[PDB]
DNA sequence: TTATTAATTCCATATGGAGACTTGGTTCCGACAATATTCAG
DNA sequence: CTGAATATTGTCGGAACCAAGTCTCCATATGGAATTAATAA
């Protein structure tokens, strides 16, 4: 399907040619630490 | 195992009728005049104090305990209670909290052997609340005497008490007021005062003393490691807190060779191009190596008999393999030479936590016995003329390498990221001059030894502190 | 005129595992005494 | 009008235990070795 290349010469000028934003980005708490005795309210990075 | 034989009689000892092997290991025909709990302490009973909202109080759990009787308490305020120590107010609304009266001993009731036993000295102010699942005793005879002759002495018996059942070893205030204390035991140290009261406070002040200068074996790497190169510890450890990162489609080859574009990756970048903004000395670690052997991991029993093995508790921030090996196996692999520790050789732990995996360390220790170490661990004979290879370890050990492997170990378990020889063939690291390298060696080299004498002078006083103890109570 | 592959074995090795063992002590349900109740002789 | 017994009110006592911290053997490619091999003078 790639065609006999090493794939990485060729992509470096692929996304050289075309280019788009992407976005990347941690959460440290999730807000909802669950242990085998239930859950239990945390801080929420995600969303409010 | 042991093999005891008790009569019918014996059950009769408590009046729970227990008959498990624990209690009874102890149990045996008495002739000294033992004491009991009447004679020197007296439980009291808890009570919820009335705390105050204005002023921040302190809570303390068994875990902020520590072995050797310090407390490590927790400064909680009602006006601040945000959701991470939700849990602690819980437990102080639900009711367990009490505020020890001045000269009480707390015993912990949960896993008595580790020895968890406090004393609230007469002395000294902030009174700090605990958890209920400590014992109140009120010593009537001489408190400081009596916590001795608890710590060091009866151990044992206190741990011959404790109740397991299907689960938690635990103690209940019928069980210390089942206990059967000597009399000679007790009567020599109490007598024996004025003198077993000054001693010990001279020796818990050195103590004390030596403890207040006590640094980590991380803040010394970090410093010296700090102090050359200009870096800002403070807006390093603001620019790690940065959960945005917003990089393009072209700049996802660059360097890579395996296109990766993880969060922890990207972060990566932007560390080692903040932490390289002013030095100008680095070069790709992949031309000074020269081989990345393993190690190899039988099955393994503890305390075994046979060749024994290392483990990853064994690299420390120092820099110097602890050779203290737990693990033995019986084993051959028809290559057993290959994988045996030698002084000199470079170390590099393979697979730990985020912040504990790439950790390196140089043997610098001279034994003659053959030691295999785990195929976790990664060896790099290196070019000794550039390197230095202490000073690699301790670069490693620093925080110059301790955000590069906590962002390039690649891993779907969290728990045991793991480093390849890749990352170490792809790591641009600082190298200075060979002079410049010494110097630092020898700083956190002799800065680390002075600490760690420290650490020594204070074992010994803690071991004479009971060696006293024992020889006024044996004589 | 041979001996270069490039396939087909085969090794010790590098890599990675919706891991997993070790150590310490924590929550929470269920009683339970003591609240209360509770109607009645 | 002297109850003790059921609304319950807050406290012990355990738990087919269980979070916290952090240390592990092993199945599985794998490729560079071997092998067969076809180049071609």
């Not at chain 2, 400081?144 to 002759?149: E, M, P, S, T, V």
């Not at chain 2, 002084?343 to 790439?358: A, K, M, Q, Y």
Request: charge should be negative; proline fraction near 4%.
């Amino acid at each position: 399907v790639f065609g006999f290349y090493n794939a990485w010469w060729v992509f470096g000028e692929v996304a050289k040619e075309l280019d788009y934003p992407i976005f990347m980005a941690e959460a440290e708490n999730v807000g909802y630490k669950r242990t085998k005795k239930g859950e239990k309210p945390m801080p929420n990075d995600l969303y409010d | 195992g042991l093999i005891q034989r008790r009569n019918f009689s014996t059950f009769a000892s408590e009046p729970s009728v227990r008959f498990d092997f624990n209690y009874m290991k102890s149990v045996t025909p008495t002739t000294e005049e033992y004491y009991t709990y009447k004679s020197l302490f007296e439980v009291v009973p808890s009570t919820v104090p009335t705390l105050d909202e204005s002023e921040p109080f302190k809570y303390a759990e068994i875990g902020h305990v520590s072995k050797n009787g310090e407390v490590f308490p927790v400064t909680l305020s009602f006006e601040d209670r945000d959701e991470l120590n939700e849990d602690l107010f819980k437990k102080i609304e639900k009711g367990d909290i009490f505020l020890p009266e001045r000269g009480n001993i707390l015993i912990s009731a949960i896993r008595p052997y580790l020895n968890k036993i406090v004393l609230i000295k007469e002395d000294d102010k902030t009174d700090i609340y605990f958890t209920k699942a400590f014992i109140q005793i009120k010593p009537l005879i001489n408190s400081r005497i009596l916590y001795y002759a608890l710590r060091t002495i009866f151990s044992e018996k206190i741990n011959a008490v404790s109740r397991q059942g299907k689960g938690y070893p635990t103690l209940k205030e019928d069980d210390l007021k089942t206990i059967q204390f000597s009399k000679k035991v007790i009567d020599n140290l109490l007598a024996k005062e004025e003198e077993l009261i000054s001693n010990i406070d001279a020796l818990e002040k050195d103590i004390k003393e030596l403890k207040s200068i006590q640094r980590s074996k991380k803040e010394i790497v970090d410093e010296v490691f700090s102090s050359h190169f200009n870096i800002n510890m403070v807006e390093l450890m603001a620019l790690d807190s940065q959960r945005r990162v917003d990089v393009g489609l072209s700049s996802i080859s660059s360097l890579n060779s395996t296109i990766r574009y993880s969060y922890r990756w990207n972060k990566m970048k932007l560390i080692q191009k903040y932490l390289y903004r002013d030095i100008d000395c680095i070069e790709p670690l992949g031309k000074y190596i020269l081989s990345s052997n393993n190690g190899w991991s039988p099955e393994s029993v503890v305390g075994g008999e046979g060749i024994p093995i290392l483990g990853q508790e064994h690299l420390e921030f120092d820099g110097v393999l602890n050779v203290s090996p737990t693990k033995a196996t019986t084993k051959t692999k028809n290559n057993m030479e290959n994988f045996f520790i030698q002084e000199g050789d470079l170390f590099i732990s393979r697979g730990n936590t985020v912040d504990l995996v790439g950790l390196a360390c140089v043997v610098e220790t001279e034994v003659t016995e053959d030691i295999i170490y785990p195929d976790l661990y990664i060896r790099l004979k290196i070019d000794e003329k550039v390197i230095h290879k202490k000073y690699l370890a301790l670069l490693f050990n620093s925080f110059f390498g301790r955000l590069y492997f906590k962002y390039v170990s690649k891993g779907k378990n969290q728990t045991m990221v793991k480093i390849s020889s890749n990352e170490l063939l792809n790591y641009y690291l600082p190298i200075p001059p060979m002079e410049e390298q010494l110097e630092i060696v020898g700083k956190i080299e002799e800065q680390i030894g002075a600490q760690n004498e420290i650490e020594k002078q204070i074992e010994e006083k803690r071991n004479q502190i009971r060696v006293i103890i024992e020889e006024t109570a044996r004589s």
